[PDB]
mmCIF file of C-alpha atoms and ligand atoms in Angstrom:
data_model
loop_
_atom_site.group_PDB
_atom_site.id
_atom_site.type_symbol
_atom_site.label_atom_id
_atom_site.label_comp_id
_atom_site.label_asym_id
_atom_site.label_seq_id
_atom_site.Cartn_x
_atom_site.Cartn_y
_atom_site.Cartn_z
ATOM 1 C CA UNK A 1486 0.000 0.000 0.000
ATOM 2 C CA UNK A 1487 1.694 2.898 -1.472
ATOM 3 C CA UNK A 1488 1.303 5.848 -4.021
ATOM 4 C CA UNK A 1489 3.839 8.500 -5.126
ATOM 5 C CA UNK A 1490 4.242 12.202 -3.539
ATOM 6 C CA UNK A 1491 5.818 13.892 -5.978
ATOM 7 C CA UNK A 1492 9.365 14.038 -8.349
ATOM 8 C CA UNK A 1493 12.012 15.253 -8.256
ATOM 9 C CA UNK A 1494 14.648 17.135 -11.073
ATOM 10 C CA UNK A 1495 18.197 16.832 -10.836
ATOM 11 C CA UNK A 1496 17.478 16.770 -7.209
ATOM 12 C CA UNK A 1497 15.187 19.698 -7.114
ATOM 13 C CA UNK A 1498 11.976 19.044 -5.359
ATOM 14 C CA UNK A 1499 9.123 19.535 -7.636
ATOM 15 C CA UNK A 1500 6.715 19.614 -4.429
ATOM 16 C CA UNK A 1501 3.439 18.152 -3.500
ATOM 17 C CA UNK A 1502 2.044 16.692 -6.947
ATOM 18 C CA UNK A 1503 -0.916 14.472 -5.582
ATOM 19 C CA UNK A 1504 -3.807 15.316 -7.916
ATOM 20 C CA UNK A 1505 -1.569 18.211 -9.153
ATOM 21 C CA UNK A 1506 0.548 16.672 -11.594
ATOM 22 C CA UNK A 1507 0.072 13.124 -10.447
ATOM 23 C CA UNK A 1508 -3.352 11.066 -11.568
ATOM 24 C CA UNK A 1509 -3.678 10.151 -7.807
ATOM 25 C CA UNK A 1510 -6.267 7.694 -6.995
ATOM 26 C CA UNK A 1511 -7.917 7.875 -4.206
ATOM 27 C CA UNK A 1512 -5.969 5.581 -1.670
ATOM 28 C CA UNK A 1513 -3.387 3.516 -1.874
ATOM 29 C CA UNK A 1514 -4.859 0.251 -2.468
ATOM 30 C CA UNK A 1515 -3.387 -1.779 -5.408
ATOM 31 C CA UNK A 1516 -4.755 -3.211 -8.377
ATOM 32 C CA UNK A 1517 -5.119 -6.666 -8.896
ATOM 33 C CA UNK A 1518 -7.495 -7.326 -11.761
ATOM 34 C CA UNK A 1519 -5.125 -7.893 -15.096
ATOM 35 C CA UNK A 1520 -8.044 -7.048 -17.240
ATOM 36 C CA UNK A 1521 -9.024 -3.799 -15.431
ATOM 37 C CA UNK A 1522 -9.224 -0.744 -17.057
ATOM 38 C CA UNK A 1523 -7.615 0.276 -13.796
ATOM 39 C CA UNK A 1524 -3.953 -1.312 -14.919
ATOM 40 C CA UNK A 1525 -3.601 1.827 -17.259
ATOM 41 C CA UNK A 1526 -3.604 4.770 -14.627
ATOM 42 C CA UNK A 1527 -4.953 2.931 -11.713
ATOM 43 C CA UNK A 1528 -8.566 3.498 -10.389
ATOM 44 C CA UNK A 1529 -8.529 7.860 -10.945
ATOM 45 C CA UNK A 1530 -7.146 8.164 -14.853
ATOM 46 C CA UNK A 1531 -7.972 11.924 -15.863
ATOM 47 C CA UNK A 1532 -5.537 15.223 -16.736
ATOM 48 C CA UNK A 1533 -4.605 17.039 -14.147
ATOM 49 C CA UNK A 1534 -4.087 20.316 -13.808
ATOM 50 C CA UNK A 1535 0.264 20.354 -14.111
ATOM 51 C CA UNK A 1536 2.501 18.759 -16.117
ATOM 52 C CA UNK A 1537 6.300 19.015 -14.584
ATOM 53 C CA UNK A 1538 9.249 20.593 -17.366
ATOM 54 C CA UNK A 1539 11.851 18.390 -17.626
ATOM 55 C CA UNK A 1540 14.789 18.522 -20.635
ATOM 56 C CA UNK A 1541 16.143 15.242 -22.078
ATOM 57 C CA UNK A 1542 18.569 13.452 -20.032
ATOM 58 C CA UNK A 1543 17.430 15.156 -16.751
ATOM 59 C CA UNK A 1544 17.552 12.642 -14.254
ATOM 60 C CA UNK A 1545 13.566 11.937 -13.174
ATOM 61 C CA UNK A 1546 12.874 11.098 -9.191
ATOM 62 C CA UNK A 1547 9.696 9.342 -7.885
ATOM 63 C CA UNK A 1548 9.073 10.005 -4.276
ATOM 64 C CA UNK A 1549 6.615 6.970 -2.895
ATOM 65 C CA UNK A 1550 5.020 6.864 0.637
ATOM 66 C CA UNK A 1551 2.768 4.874 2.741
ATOM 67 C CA UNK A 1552 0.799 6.799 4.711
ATOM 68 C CA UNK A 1553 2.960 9.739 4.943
ATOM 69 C CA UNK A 1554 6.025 11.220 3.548
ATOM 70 C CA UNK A 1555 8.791 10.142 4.002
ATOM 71 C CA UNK A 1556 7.543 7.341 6.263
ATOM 72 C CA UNK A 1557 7.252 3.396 6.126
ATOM 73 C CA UNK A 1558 7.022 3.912 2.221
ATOM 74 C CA UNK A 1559 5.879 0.495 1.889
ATOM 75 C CA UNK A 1560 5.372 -2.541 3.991
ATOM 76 C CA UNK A 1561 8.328 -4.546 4.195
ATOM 77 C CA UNK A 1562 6.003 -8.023 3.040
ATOM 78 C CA UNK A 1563 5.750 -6.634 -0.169
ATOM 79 C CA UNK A 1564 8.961 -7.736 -1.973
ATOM 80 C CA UNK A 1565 8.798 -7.173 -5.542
ATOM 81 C CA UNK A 1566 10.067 -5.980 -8.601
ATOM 82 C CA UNK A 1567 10.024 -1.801 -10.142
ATOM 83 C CA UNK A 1568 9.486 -0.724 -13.116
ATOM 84 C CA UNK A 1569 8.971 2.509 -15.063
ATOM 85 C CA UNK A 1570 7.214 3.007 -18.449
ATOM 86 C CA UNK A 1571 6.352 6.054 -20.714
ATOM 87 C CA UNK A 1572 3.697 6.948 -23.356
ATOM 88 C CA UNK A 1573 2.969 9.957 -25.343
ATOM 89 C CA UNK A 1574 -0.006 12.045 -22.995
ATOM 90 C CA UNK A 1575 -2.466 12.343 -25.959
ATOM 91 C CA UNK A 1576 -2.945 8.442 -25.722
ATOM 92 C CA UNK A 1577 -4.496 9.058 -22.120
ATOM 93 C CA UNK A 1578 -2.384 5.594 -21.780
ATOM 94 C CA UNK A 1579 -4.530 3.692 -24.533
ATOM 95 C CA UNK A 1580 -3.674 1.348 -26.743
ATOM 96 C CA UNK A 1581 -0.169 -0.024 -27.848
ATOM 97 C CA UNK A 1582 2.095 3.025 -26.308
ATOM 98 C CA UNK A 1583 3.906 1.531 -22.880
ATOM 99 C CA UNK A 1584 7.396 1.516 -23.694
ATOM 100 C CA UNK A 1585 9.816 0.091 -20.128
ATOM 101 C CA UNK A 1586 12.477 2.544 -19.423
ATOM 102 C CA UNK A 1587 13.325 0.971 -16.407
ATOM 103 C CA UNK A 1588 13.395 -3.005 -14.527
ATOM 104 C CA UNK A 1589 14.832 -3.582 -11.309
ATOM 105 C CA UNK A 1590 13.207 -7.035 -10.053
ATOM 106 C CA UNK A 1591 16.235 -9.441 -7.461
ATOM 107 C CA UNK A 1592 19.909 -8.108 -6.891
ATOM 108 C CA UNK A 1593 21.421 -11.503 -6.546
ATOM 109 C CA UNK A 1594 24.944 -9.060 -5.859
ATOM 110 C CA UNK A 1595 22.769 -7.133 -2.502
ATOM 111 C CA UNK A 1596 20.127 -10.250 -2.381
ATOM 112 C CA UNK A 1597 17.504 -7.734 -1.756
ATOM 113 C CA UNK A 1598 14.644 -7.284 -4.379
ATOM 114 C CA UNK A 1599 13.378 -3.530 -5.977
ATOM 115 C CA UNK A 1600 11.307 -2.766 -2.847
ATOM 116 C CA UNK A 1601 13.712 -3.578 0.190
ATOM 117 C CA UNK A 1602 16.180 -0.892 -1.626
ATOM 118 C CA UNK A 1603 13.042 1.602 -2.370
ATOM 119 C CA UNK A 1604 12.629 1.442 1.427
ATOM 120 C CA UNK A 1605 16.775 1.965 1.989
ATOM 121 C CA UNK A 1606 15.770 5.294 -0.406
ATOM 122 C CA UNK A 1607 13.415 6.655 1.387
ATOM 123 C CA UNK A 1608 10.710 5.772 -1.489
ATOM 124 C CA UNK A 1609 12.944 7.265 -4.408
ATOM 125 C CA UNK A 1610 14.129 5.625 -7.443
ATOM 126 C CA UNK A 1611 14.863 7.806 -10.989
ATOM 127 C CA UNK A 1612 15.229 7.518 -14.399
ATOM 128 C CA UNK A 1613 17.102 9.496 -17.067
ATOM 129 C CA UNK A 1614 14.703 11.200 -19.476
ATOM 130 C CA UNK A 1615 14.916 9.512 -22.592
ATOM 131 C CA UNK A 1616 15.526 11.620 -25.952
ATOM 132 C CA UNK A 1617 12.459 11.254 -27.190
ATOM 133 C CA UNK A 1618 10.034 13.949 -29.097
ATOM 134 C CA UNK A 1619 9.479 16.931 -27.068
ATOM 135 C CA UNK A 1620 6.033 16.989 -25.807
ATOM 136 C CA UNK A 1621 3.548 15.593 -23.175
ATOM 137 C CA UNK A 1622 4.107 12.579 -21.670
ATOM 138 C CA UNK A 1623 2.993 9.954 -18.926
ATOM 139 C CA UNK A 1624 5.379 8.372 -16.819
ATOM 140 C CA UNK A 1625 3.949 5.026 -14.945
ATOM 141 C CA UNK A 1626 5.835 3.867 -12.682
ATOM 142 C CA UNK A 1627 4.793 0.357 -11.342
ATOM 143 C CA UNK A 1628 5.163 -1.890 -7.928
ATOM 144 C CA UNK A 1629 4.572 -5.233 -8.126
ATOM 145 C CA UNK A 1630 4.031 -6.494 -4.709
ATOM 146 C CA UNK A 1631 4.780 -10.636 -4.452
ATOM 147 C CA UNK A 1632 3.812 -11.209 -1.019
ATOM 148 C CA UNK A 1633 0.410 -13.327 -1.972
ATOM 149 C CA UNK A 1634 1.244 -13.717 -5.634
ATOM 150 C CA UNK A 1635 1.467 -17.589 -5.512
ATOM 151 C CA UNK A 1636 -2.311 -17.342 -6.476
ATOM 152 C CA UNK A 1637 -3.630 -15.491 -9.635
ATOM 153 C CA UNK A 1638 -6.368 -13.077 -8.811
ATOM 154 C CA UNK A 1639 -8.223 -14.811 -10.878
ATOM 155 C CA UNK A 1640 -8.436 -17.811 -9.336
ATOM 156 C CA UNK A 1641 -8.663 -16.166 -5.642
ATOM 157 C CA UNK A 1642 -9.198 -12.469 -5.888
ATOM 158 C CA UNK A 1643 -7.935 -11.918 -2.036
ATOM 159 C CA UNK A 1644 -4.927 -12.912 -3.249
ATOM 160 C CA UNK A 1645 -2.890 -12.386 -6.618
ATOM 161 C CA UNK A 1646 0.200 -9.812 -7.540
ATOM 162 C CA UNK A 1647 -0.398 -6.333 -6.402
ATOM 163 C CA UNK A 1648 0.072 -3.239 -8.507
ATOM 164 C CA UNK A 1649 1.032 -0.336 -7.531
ATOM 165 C CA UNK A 1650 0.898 2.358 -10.355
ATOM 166 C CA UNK A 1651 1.225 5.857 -10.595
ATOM 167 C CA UNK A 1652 1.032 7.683 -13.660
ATOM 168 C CA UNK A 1653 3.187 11.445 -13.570
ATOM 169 C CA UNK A 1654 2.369 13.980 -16.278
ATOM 170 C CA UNK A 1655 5.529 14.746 -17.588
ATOM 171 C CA UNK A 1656 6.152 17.305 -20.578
ATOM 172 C CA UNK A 1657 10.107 17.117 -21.998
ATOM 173 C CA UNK A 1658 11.030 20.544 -23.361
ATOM 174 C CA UNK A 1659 14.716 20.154 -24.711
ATOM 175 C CA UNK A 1660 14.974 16.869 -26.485
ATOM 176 C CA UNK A 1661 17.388 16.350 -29.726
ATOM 177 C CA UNK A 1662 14.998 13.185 -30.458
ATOM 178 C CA UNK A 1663 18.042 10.887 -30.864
ATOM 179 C CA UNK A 1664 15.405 7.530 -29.666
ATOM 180 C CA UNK A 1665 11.998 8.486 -31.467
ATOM 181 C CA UNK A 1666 9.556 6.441 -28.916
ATOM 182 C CA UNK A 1667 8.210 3.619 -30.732
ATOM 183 C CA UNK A 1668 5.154 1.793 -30.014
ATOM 184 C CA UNK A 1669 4.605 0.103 -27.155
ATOM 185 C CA UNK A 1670 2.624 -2.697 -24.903
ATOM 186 C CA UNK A 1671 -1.053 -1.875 -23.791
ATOM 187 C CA UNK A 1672 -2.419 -1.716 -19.904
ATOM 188 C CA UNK A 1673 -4.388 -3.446 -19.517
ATOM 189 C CA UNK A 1674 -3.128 -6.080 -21.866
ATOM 190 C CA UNK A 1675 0.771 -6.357 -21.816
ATOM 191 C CA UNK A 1676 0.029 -8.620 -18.419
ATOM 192 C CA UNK A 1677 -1.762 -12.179 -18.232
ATOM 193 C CA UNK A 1678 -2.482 -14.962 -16.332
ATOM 194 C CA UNK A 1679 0.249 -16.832 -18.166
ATOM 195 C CA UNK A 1680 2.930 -13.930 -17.774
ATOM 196 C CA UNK A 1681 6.225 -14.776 -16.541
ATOM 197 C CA UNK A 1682 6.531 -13.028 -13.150
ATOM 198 C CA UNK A 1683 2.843 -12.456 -12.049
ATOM 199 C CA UNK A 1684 2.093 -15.914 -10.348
ATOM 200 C CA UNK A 1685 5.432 -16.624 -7.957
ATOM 201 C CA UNK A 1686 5.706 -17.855 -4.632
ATOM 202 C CA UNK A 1687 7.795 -16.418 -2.844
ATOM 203 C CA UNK A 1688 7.971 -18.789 -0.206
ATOM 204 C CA UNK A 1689 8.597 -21.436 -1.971
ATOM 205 C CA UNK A 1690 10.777 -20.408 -5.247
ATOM 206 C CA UNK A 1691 13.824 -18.841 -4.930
ATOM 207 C CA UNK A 1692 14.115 -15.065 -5.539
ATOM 208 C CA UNK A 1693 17.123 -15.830 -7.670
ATOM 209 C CA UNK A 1694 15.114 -17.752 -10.246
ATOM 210 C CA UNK A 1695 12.086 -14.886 -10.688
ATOM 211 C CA UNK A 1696 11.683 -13.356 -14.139
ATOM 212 C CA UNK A 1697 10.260 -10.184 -14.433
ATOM 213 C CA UNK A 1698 6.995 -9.063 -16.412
ATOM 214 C CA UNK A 1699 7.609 -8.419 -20.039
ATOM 215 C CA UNK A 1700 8.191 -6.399 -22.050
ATOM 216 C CA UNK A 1701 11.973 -6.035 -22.124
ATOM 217 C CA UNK A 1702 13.600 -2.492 -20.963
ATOM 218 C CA UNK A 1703 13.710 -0.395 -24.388
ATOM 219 C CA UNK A 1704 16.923 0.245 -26.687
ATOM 220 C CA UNK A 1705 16.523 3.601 -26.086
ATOM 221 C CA UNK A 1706 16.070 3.751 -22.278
ATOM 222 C CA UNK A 1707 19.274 5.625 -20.669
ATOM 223 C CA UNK A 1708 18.800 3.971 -16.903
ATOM 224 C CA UNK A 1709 18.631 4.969 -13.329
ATOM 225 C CA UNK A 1710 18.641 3.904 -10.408
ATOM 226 C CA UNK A 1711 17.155 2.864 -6.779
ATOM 227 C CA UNK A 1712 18.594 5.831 -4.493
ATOM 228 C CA UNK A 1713 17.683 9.024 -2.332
ATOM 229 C CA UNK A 1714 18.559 12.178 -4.661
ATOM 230 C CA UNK A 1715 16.695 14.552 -2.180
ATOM 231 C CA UNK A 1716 16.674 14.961 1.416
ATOM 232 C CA UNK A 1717 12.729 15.527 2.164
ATOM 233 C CA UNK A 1718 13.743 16.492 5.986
ATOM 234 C CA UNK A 1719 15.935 19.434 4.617
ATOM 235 C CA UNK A 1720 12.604 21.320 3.768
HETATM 236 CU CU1 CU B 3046 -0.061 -3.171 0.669
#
């Protein structure tokens, strides 16, 4: 149970963005359901009012929190992988757009999956901007939660893979369009029943053997990383 703050820019705070210049749902509850209309955005998908500048090559910040910031973050049950993916905004996340910038599932070197270091970062974890078309943009960033994933939702909707997904409104002035975004994997969609990575037991299969969620991280994505760029108790 978790949702994102705000970003930040080069280590600039970009402040409060909950229903500002993040689609904020309403709580922090994941999404479970595969075939929800919910997997795009989660539950709240509209524009808000913001969109934050950013220039090629900046590098990109999510905050996350639990309850509060700069708290908990998440619950420490809910290993799991991280990843980030972008569309152009004028697909309001529909249809084939989702391209990954960004996978971070088990560090066999740290043996410590995404989430245990997104805790160690005080909820932050960045990409670069990629050099893609200037314009609008959403950024979804995504939290898959393992802790009752042996089931599929589908079989036992208490259980199942939890997502947690956050879509930022992003619009990239200064971009020499050196990686022209191609097209990309739909939410809901890209994600099945049959998926590698969405039915795994983690208490009975070894963290060292998961496979993350297609699709593959993109040619063109630059990085990043899982690591506090900001001090939140500075402010
Ligand atoms: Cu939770």
């Amino acid at each position: 149970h978790t949702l994102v703050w705000g970003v930040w820019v080069n280590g600039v705070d970009q402040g409060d963005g909950r229903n500002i210049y993040i689609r904020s749902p309403p709580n922090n509850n994941p999404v479970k359901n595969l075939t929800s209309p919910d997997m795009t955005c989660n539950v709240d998908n509209r524009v808000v009012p913001k969109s934050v500048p950013v220039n090629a090559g900046d590098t990109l910040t999510f905050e996350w929190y639990h309850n509060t910031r700069d708290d908990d973050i998440i619950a420490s049950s809910h290993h799991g992988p991280i990843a980030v993916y972008i569309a152009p905004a004028a697909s309001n996340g529909q249809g084939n757009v989702w391209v990954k910038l960004f996978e971070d599932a088990y560090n066999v070197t740290n043996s410590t999956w995404a989430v245990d270091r997104l805790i160690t970062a005080h909820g932050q974890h960045s990409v670069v901007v990629p050099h893609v078309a200037p314009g609008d943009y959403l950024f979804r960033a995504e939290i898959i939660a393992l802790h009752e994933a042996d089931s599929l939702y589908s079989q036992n909707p208490i259980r199942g893979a939890q997502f947690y997904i956050s879509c930022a409104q992003i619009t990239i002035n200064s971009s020499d369009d050196s990686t022209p975004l191609p097209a990309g994997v739909p939410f809901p969609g890209a994600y099945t029943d049959s998926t590698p990575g969405i039915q795994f037991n983690i208490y009975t299969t070894p963290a060292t053997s998961y496979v993350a969620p297609p699709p593959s991280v993109w040619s063109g994505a630059l990085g990043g990383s899982i690591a506090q760029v900001g001090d939140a108790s500075l402010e």
